């Protein structure tokens, strides 16, 4: 969707890889983020797969 692409442009241009890896490594932080954003579970899965592809690069 377009909202996933907005999270992608936001995570690339405004978040450090140390802050992004602290989110992908800590499930407590991740759960707090998706609940705060009110993401449907399928978009939260797509976004986590996308942010893992981006963080490894």
């Amino acid at each position, epitope marked *: 969707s377009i909202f996933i692409e907005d999270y992608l442009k936001y995570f690339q241009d405004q978040v450090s890889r140390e802050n992004l890896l602290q989110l992908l490594t800590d499930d407590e932080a991740w*759960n707090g983020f*998706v*609940a705060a954003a*009110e993401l*449907p*579970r*399928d978009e*939260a*899965d797509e976004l986590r797969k996308a942010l893992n592809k981006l963080a490894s690069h």
Partner: antibody
Amino acid sequence: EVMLVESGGGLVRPGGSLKLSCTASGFTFSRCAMSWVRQTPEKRLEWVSAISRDSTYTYYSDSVKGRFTVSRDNAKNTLYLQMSSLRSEDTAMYYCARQIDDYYVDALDYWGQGTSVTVSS
Amino acid sequence: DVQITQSPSYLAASPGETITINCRASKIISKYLAWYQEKPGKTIKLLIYSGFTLQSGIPSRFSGSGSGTDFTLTISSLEPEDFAMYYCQQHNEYPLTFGAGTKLEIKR
């Protein structure tokens, strides 16, 4: 043995108020998100409201938003549903249900026996 | 709101037969669909969640399939205790929505 008991149901006039309550046992209530579901006389199931583990987030359906308010007391192991501006459309059997803890929104793995509410002049 | 189209509304079957209840969503929900059994007198029971995860205690003859938009609940070799009311539900997002129900009745 998980136990969900709801009470406070009854007869109410259109425009009136009512406070349903649900006491839980057999599990640590403070670690679980809860939902309110209702079954109409036409037998349709309809999700009403939900409250998070520690009251941080509340959720309501379109038909009920602004009139109903969900709340909980983890010390007293209770969940509540304050209802107001009641409509004949709210005549149903109301169930407190426990959600599975894999995501903030999830399937309902335990349901209570129900409490009947009737809105009529 | 995600709309769920559950079919058939009524289903006549005999014990030992295999049946399938269908469930279609108005938008993509991945595997996030649950199935419930409602019998008169007893509480509402969760059979499956996340499309195909069988809930603990439920017999292996209840089997869920599908992902994305179309789902199916299959009951193989029907037992007399399975003639009841079945409901699907999406648990992908709030508001949690339900299908209209399927009454599984006894053929004669």
